[PDB]
């Protein structure tokens, strides 16, 4: 039902970017350009 709901897929990337934006403004208050996904998506054992 997620793959069928396009409103939920839009909301899912909106909330994912919201979580990533809170991580990024916890890093630096200036919102970056081209922030690497590697710091978010790396597993916790490998540091991410």
């Amino acid at each position: 039902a997620v793959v069928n709901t396009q409103e939920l897929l839009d909301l899912l990337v909106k909330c994912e970017n919201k979580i990533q934006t809170r991580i990024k403004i916890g890093l630096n208050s200036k919102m970056p350009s081209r922030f690497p996904p590697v710091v978010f998506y790396t597993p916790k054992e490998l540091g991410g």
Binding site: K18, R22, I25, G26, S29
Partner: protein
């Protein structure tokens, strides 16, 4: 109302800063009828007897005491400056300037932690402490 005490000239302010040897002189520079200063004085009143073991809170009207307007750059509605043993304690809040607070925080625990940080870094001797929060973003979600 504002049961916090008031400095009505430059002598009352400078001797109120020089009065304390082991407590942070927290001074609000603003007008009691301002809404920003009214909320900031509500926050300072709700913690005035919490932090009484390591701080003192004074209110200062800008119209009544205008001599600190140029030196302390009191050009915002409320400013909250922190002093300890005559030294002006600056705080890297993240707002861009470190000298004053210059807005009204609504969390009284954040004001308790800012005063507690100023106390810990000032008895250690720093003129600049780092706030235990970053106030550059308003953290609204």
């Amino acid at each position: 109302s504002y049961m916090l005490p008031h400095l009505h000239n430059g002598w009352q302010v400078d001797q109120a800063i020089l009065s304390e040897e082991d407590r942070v002189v927290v001074i609000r520079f603003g007008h009691d009828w301002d809404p920003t200063c009214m909320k900031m004085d509500e926050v300072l009143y709700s913690i005035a007897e919490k932090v009484k073991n390591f701080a003192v809170i004074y209110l200062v009207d800008i119209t009544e005491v205008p001599d600190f307007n140029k030196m302390y750059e009191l050009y915002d509605p409320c400013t909250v400056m922190f002093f300890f043993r005559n030294k002006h304690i600056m705080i890297d809040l993240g707002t861009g300037n470190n000298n004053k607070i210059n807005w009204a925080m609504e969390d009284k625990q954040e004001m308790v932690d800012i005063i507690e940080t100023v106390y810990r870094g000032a008895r250690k001797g720093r003129g600049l402490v780092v706030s235990p929060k970053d106030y550059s973003t308003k953290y609204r979600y």
